[PDB]
């Protein structure tokens, strides 16, 4: 029902990187979220049955060629659930002549690997009164200048208790979730009629992948459960916004592809996931694509915002 939330930015030398540890302590449990921009933006989610679990970070090992074991939650015997979510690629499709709801949504351009981005230092963004921080980035190699005045931002917010923000999309949170907002702002598309998207990968349980469980889109709710509750989950509305003020008229559909079992080798390499889990090959990946071929788009103001919740336990009953 309520949790005491601590947030720390954890730094090292050499080769400083953005690492954010959110620790939400209940009466007999802790939820740990470890967010990082070392490699593609990733979060490691760990649920423990003690109010005293701790995160250990070995920075030199985390930055080495074999980082397995560099991140740990201790004691290991207290871990009830652990998994990860990785944002691997920023996708772009030319939708000229495509139909709404097509798969793929358009003719794909070469995706931007989010492992090849550089990021601002998150220390400055950390806002302890709002329990938030953000990771803002752009490609390291941008020969076309597409991000000369553009960035992709991942804003993370934790919660101490249940509530429903006033700002659209007004997802109901509990103390068992973080909210993530992803915003693409001011980057140049590579042609007209571009639809943007994100490739998302989760760490699966066994060989096979869960399905998305599904009123205008602003009152709809999609949910992905890692396993039967209590367990990891993500929830979002199938809407994104193409204007910063998120006027209803700026709403765009957010379509999710089916989840595909995916090998590590088909995704950008994550040192964070490998540090916590060792070498693993059971990922589940899907593409989220924003917008239709006509109507509002990223093309209006070069703005796209999408929000989701990520949590452990029972999902918020958002009804």
């Amino acid at each position, epitope marked *: 029902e309520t949790r005491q939330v601590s947030m720390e930015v954890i730094s090292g030398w050499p080769n400083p990187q953005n690492l954010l540890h959110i620790r939400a302590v209940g009466s007999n449990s802790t939820l740990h979220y470890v967010w990082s921009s070392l490699g593609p933006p990733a979060v490691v989610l760990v649920a423990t049955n003690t109010t005293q679990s701790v995160l250990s970070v070995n920075w030199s090992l985390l930055l080495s060629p074999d980082p*397995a074991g560099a991140l740990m939650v201790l004691p290991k015997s207290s871990i009830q659930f652990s998994s990860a979510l990785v944002f691997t690629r920023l996708l772009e499709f030319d939708s000229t002549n495509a139909s709404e709801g097509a798969q793929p949504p358009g003719k794909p351009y070469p995706p931007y690997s989010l492992a090849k981005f550089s990021w601002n230092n998150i220390t400055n963004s950390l806002d302890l009164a709002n329990l938030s921080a953000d990771f803002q980035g752009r490609p390291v190699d941008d020969p076309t200048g597409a991000f000369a005045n553009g960035s992709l931002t991942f804003k993370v917010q934790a919660f101490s208790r249940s509530g429903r923000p006033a700002q659209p999309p007004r997802l109901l949170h509990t103390a068992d979730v973080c909210q993530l907002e992803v915003a693409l702002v001011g980057a140049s598309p590579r042609g007209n009629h571009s639809l943007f998207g994100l490739e998302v990968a989760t760490l699966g349980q*066994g*060989p*096979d992948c869960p399905s998305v469980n599904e009123a205008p889109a602003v009152f709809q709710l999609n949910q992905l459960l890692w396993g039967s509750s209590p367990s990891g989950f993500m929830q979002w509305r199938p809407v994104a916004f193409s204007e910063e003020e998120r006027a209803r008229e700026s709403a765009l559909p957010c379509q999710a592809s089916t989840l595909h*079992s995916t*090998l590590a080798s*088909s995704l950008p390499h994550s040192p964070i996931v490998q540090a916590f889990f*060792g*070498s693993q090959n*059971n990922f589940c990946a899907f593409n989220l694509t924003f917008g239709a071929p006509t109507g509002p788009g990223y093309w209006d103001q070069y703005y796209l915002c999408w929000s989701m919740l990520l949590g452990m336990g029972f999902p918020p009953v958002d009804i």
Partner: antibody
Amino acid sequence: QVQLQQSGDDLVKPGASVKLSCKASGYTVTSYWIDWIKQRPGQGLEWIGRIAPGSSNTYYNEIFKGKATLTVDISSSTAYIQLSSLSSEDSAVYFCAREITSATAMEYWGQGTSVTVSS
Amino acid sequence: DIQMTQSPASLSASVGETVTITCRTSGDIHSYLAWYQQKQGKSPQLLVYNAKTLVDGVPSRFSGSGSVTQYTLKISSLQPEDFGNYYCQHFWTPPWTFGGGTKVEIKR
């Protein structure tokens, strides 16, 4: 307790097909991938492919696409490989193996089934 | 694909000696690499996975290490029962091929 029990050694005619089986027991069959591996007499190991028993999702080595077809019967916890259009190069021992949880090794192996292609 | 070169193809050593088998890959495989031993007339048995993790029950004289493109199996204090064929296998981009093998012979 984890066991993979493979079908008996076989003689098969050139150009016919043969279906080999591997019955898994001692664990929940849908929680792990199953792979097939080929070994010609005196030679090294060749990876054929893998199958996820819950979904029948497969990966194949391109060398065996159209030679080999993987299937599973979940109710009987049995993996099958069908080898079609057989020739002498197909004479070999075929192993089934279960992947480890992380899907980054083959931990439990069956005993192998020898196939000889001859008239 | 990933190309793998396992070397040497054969080695001969005496009981009590320490020997090494190397597997070099064409690209970084991030420790997605296993080692097997195969004895005459038997199935292969997994010795080490994820480059360096020893399987429970496997004698501690076997060890693996490596990263990036260079992986090594070490057998300390070689015993007569170590005779046989050894194979690396990667689990990076499919196909998940095997090294060409190393035959270990025992001098006596």
